[PDB]
Amino acid sequence: IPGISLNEDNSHYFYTRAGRRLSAEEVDSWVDQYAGTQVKELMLCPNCMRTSYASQVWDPIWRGYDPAGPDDQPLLASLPPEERVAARGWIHTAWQLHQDGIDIYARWIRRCRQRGISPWISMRMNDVHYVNDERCFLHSEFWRENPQLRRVPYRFAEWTDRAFDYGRAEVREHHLKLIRELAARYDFDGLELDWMRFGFHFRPGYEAEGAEILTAFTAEVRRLLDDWEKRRGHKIHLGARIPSRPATALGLGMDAVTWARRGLVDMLVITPFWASAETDMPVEIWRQLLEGTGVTLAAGLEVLLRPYPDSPLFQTNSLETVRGAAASLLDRGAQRIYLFNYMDSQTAMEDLENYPTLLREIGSLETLAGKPRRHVLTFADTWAPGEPRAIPLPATCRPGEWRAFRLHTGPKPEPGEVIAALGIEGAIGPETLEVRVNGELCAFLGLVDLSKPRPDFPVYGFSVPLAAMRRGYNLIEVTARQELRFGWAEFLIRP
Amino acid sequence: IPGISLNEDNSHYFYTRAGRRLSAEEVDSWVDQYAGTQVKELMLCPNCMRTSYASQVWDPIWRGYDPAGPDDQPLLASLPPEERVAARGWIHTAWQLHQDGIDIYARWIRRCRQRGISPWISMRMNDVHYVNDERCFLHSEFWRENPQLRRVPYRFAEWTDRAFDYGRAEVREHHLKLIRELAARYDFDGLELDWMRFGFHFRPGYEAEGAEILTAFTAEVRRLLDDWEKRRGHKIHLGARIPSRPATALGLGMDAVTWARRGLVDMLVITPFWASAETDMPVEIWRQLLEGTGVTLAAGLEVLLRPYPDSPLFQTNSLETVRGAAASLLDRGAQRIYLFNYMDSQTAMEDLENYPTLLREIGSLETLAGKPRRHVLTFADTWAPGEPRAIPLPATCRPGEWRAFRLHTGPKPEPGEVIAALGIEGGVAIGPETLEVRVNGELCAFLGLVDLSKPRPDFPVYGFSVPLAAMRRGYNLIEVTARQELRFGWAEFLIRP
Numbered sequence A: 001i002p003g004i005s006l007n008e009d010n011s012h013y014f015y016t017r018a019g020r021r022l023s024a025e026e027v028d029s030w031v032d033q034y035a036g037t038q039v040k041e042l043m044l045c046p047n048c049m050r051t052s053y054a055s056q057v058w059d060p061i062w063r064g065y066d067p068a069g070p071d072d073q074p075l076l077a078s079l080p081p082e083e084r085v086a087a088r089g090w091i092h093t094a095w096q097l098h099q100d101g102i103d104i105y106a107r108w109i110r111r112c113r114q115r116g117i118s119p120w121i122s123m124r125m126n127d128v129h130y131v132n133d134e135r136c137f138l139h140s141e142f143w144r145e146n147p148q149l150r151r152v153p154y155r156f157a158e159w160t161d162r163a164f165d166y167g168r169a170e171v172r173e174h175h176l177k178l179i180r181e182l183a184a185r186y187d188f189d190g191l192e193l194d195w196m197r198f199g200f201h202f203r204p205g206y207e208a209e210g211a212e213i214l215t216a217f218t219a220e221v222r223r224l225l226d227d228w229e230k231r232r233g234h235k236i237h238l239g240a241r242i243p244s245r246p247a248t249a250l251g252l253g254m255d256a257v258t259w260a261r262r263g264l265v266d267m268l269v270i271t272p273f274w275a276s277a278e279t280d281m282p283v284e285i286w287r288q289l290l291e292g293t294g295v296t297l298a299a300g301l302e303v304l305l306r307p308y309p310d311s312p313l314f315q316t317n318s319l320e321t322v323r324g325a326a327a328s329l330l331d332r333g334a335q336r337i338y339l340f341n342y343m344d345s346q347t348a349m350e351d352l353e354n355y356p357t358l359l360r361e362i363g364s365l366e367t368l369a370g371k372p373r374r375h376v377l378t379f380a381d382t383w384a385p386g387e388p389r390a391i392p393l394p395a396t397c398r399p400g401e402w403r404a405f406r407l408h409t410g411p412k413p414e415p416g417e418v419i420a421a422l423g424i425e426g427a428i429g430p431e432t433l434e435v436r437v438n439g440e441l442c443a444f445l446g447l448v449d450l451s452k453p454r455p456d457f458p459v460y461g462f463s464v465p466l467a468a469m470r471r472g473y474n475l476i477e478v479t480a481r482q483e484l485r486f487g488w489a490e491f492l493i494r495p
Numbered sequence B: 001i002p003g004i005s006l007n008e009d010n011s012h013y014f015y016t017r018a019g020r021r022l023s024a025e026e027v028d029s030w031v032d033q034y035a036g037t038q039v040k041e042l043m044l045c046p047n048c049m050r051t052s053y054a055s056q057v058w059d060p061i062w063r064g065y066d067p068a069g070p071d072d073q074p075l076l077a078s079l080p081p082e083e084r085v086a087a088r089g090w091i092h093t094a095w096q097l098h099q100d101g102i103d104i105y106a107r108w109i110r111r112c113r114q115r116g117i118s119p120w121i122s123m124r125m126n127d128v129h130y131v132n133d134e135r136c137f138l139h140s141e142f143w144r145e146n147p148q149l150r151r152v153p154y155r156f157a158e159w160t161d162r163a164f165d166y167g168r169a170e171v172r173e174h175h176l177k178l179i180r181e182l183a184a185r186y187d188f189d190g191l192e193l194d195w196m197r198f199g200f201h202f203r204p205g206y207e208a209e210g211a212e213i214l215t216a217f218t219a220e221v222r223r224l225l226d227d228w229e230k231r232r233g234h235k236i237h238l239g240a241r242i243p244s245r246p247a248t249a250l251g252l253g254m255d256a257v258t259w260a261r262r263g264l265v266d267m268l269v270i271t272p273f274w275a276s277a278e279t280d281m282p283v284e285i286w287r288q289l290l291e292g293t294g295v296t297l298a299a300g301l302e303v304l305l306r307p308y309p310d311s312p313l314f315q316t317n318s319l320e321t322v323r324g325a326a327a328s329l330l331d332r333g334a335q336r337i338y339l340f341n342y343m344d345s346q347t348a349m350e351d352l353e354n355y356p357t358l359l360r361e362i363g364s365l366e367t368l369a370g371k372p373r374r375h376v377l378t379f380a381d382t383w384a385p386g387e388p389r390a391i392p393l394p395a396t397c398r399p400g401e402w403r404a405f406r407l408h409t410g411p412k413p414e415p416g417e418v419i420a421a422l423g424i425e426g427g428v429a430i431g432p433e434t435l436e437v438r439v440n441g442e443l444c445a446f447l448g449l450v451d452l453s454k455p456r457p458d459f460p461v462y463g464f465s466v467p468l469a470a471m472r473r474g475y476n477l478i479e480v481t482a483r484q485e486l487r488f489g490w491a492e493f494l495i496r497p
């Protein structure tokens, strides 16, 4: 079966377990929820601009920390009073584990290997959370002291504006120092260069030179791990997270076809940044690009599910919507489903009771088969600077005009019900819309009470004749008698 | 050098030479203007829904024609009186040629090799001109009698709604009858399948089964040409015209990577349909996709240059703007520049005096190098039904907001002037500090209003002096912020040593 790669971020475990002395036994139990599922690999993130373990070459999260002191101390001063409580949870929990001689990543790796999971280290290569606050606890003293090493000096409109420029040798050396320590300190099966935090690593306009620079950096990483294979006596993998379309990937200085062909990486994770999980990604094109290279292609899901970038909705995926994306992507040739931000609490799916069910279904077409699923239209949140953007929603239809929406619904539906659903933003009757799926007339059903995630405007349901649906993309065509704007579209498949 | 491939359409010669009695010598003389140029292959197109030659298996353009009759005769009755004169120039020149025992395509093929040019035939697979007019002279009787074989029966909002559905067996057989006759009648160096007239071949939603079907159809074509290889005593090439981006090509049922890997085709032309040349096409991606297949990748240019699909401007490329596109696409790895609608008259660049210079320059970075060129921002006119569209212009900038435009300018600039030029739509006057323009992060000095040569917008264009050493090989980034709300309708890089 393809199976699941699940990412545990750098902060979550420390935020959620704060205020309790953690025993080695408890730390170990975290790995156990993942045993005997479709999870093949845990990607354990130990860093932002700072480490959550006791690094000797970077700043740990607790550098500057007074354990005994009040919340209002120099490290937390720049935060509002209530946000210091959460930040100090992370800082104090990670500190107290060090004090107790517990290395969390050393214990998780060891427990993974007992429970038949492959343990990975995922490194955040260029995290910029809260760089609007130059005094923030989670920035490195290296970032604070070296404003000249940033990507964009002439403006500050986005956090990525203040990310590090890997065009600079001092910047590449800074990140290679952590990878050198991480190789030494931890015997992991694989290192995953998480380029997708936050995906922007070069001066605007120098991305072509950047592609050469990143390919050369990757080669140095692979050479280092080749040396640790001998010391460690087992193969060590190298993977990377990159954008969802191949033109955007190259446009952000990530030429992965070259990394693959030169044998530098053996896994690639195509993924959005954050704003929504892309239900539509061109997997088939990447498979053709990567033919013969021995690289596993993983399709990355994010937790949010949102219809367009300006939407005020911030709801997460549900078991049904993840079943929809999983079936789609596996059908298109994904060799792994990768879950970022699907954790056991706080940053997680809102229907959390379904978590164990999810970890045992979405890694295979046979386990998803004949279970209800939802294929929601969304959008690509990440484009190279000045690259034309393609955003389906929202969509206006004037009187007598036609609008089409293609949605990837993966395997041909089993015997059962198929609904096409359309949310209208801003007053329709049953004859205002004519809806066809693959040419075929769909019967009006009336208003549909959607489970979360759902818009906050009316959703109208159309009955699709079962035999209309095909394998892969499905085409919703509509014409309106009155001017309307669409803000949501999905297929629901219910055997 | 990569060189040029140049497409002569099915109608143009007959339109422009109408009302002269043509001799064999004159007919031969057409090829001669392409001799001693960077043109390597003439793509000769003999068909729409009707052939311009005397077919035995399809309708010639003159089926139903009364040579002696008046303009107002059955074949032309459906047309406005003025439009009848031009239509009949096409029908009567193609008819008279046949009456005088001249097969125009036989003669062009022969002359081509006398002149060192490789001659190709280029078939239009699904032309739909004027299908709003059910009684139009240039439709096949097969098309008129078989409305059930069209793509879309539930509406007529575009010509492509009445295109044929290649998902049907009877449609494939109809187009395979023409290929079988073309391979028998003409000794060509290769056949091009022109899928991009007009690009839409399948019922909306069935493009996945369409891909499997067109791959098998391409496999039958290749197998048939393998047979003719032994009869003709030399190699016959098979090529196709496909969309500009791999996701759209597959979405319209064209899996060219499979055609290339299975050895079905040895040339692919990536191209827009019509509405504008694309100056930005992902050549480098296609090159990675086709690696190890020996397929010749050609970048197709169209004659129109327009900034956005809803623009009312209909101006053609200039020598400078083709220099621009050509340099960009070669720099990116195009193994040929392919010209569509760049004829010798009527359907032609507006600066026609510069056509001989064009056919001697755009074929190599060496012959383009140091020469004035323009790199204009446009748009891709063709997307798969319901595929989201990425259109850069027009672009609104609110006060203190930033907008970026990435323009592919191919080779680094030689010692000279580089200008970023930006057209502002609407009735709003800017000051010289209204805009802040950066290229690859570097400030560009306001130059004032630019008087662009055609093609150009009908709204003010402002020029910014780019520091030379800012510019890089490949994509170059324009970043703009405005102190007042503005809409951009035009962007370019002008590079003049």
Ligand SMILES: O=C(CO)N[C@H]1[C@H]([C@H](O)[C@H](O)CO)O[C@](O)(C(=O)O)C[C@@H]1O
Binding pocket: A009, A010, A011, A012, A015, A047, A048, A127, A129, A138, A197, A274, A341, A346, A347
């Ligand atoms: O906000 C929290 C928990 O309070 N953690 C966030 C977490 C957090 O801000 C970082 O781990 C800080 O280094 O960041 C992410 O992992 C992310 O980058 O997508 C999402 C997660 O919700």
Ligand SMILES: O=C(CO)N[C@H]1[C@H]([C@H](O)[C@H](O)CO)O[C@](O)(C(=O)O)C[C@@H]1O
Binding pocket: B009, B010, B011, B012, B015, B048, B127, B129, B138, B197, B274, B341, B346, B347
């Ligand atoms: O309209 C005319 C004749 O004046 N020729 C047009 C020509 C013409 O309509 C067709 O050859 C008729 O089948 O079509 C094209 O080649 C085209 O498809 O882009 C354009 C060309 O300008």
